[PDB]
C-alpha cells in the first residue's frame, strides 16, 4: 500500500499540475483571441466555459469568422433549445469540412473543459 500511495501521490501531483497549468494558459489565450474578433460586434465573454453554454455566442463568433448568414437561434431558454443552438453551430462547422472528433452538443452544454478547448482550437486552426 506504501508504493501504491506513492504512485497515487505522483499521479495526483504532477499529472494534475502540468495539465491544469497548460489548460489555464490556453484558456486565457483563447479568451483573448475570441474577444478580439467578437469586439467587431458589441459582444464580449468573461468566462470561456460559462458563456459558450447557451450557444448564441458560438453562432455570433462563427458568423463573424465565416462571413455569411447562419440560421437564427431557436427562441428559447430551456436545455433542449440550448442543445439545438449548439447543434446549429456544429452542423455549420460540418459544412466547412472541418473535422471535429468526439464533439456533441451536450458536451458543450454540460461544460466539459477539454472538449470546449479543443473546439476553440479547431476553429482557430481552420479560420486563421
Amino acid at each position: 500500500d506504501n508504493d501504491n500511495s506513492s504512485a497515487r501521490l505522483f499521479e495526483r501531483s504532477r499529472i494534475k499540475a502540468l495539465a491544469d497549468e497548460r489548460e489555464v494558459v490556453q484558456k486565457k489565450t483563447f479568451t483573448k483571441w475570441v474577444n478580439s474578433h467578437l469586439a467587431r460586434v458589441s459582444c464580449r465573454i468573461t468566462d470561456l466555459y460559462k458563456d459558450l453554454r447557451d450557444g448564441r455566442m458560438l453562432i455570433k463568433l462563427l458568423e463573424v469568422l465565416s462571413g455569411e448568414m447562419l440560421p437564427k437561434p431557436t427562441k428559447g431558454k430551456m436545455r433542449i433549445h440550448c442543445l439545438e443552438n449548439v447543434d446549429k453551430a456544429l452542423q455549420f462547422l460540418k459544412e466547412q469540412r472541418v473535422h471535429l472528433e468526439n464533439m456533441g452538443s451536450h458536451d458543450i452544454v454540460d461544460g466539459n473543459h477539454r472538449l470546449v478547448l479543443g473546439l476553440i482550437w479547431t476553429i482557430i486552426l481552420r479560420f486563421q
Binding site: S13, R14, A17, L18, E21, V25
Partner: protein, 38 residues
Amino acid sequence: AVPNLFVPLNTNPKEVQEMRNKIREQNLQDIKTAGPQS
C-alpha cells in the same frame, strides 16, 4: 555484419545519465511549466 547499425558510435555515456538526472530533479523541484506555444 552491421551490429551497430541502429545506433551512432562514439557517444559519451555520461550525457544520458546527466539528462536523466535533470528530468529526475524536475520532480523534486516540481516546477510547473506550460506546454510549448504553437
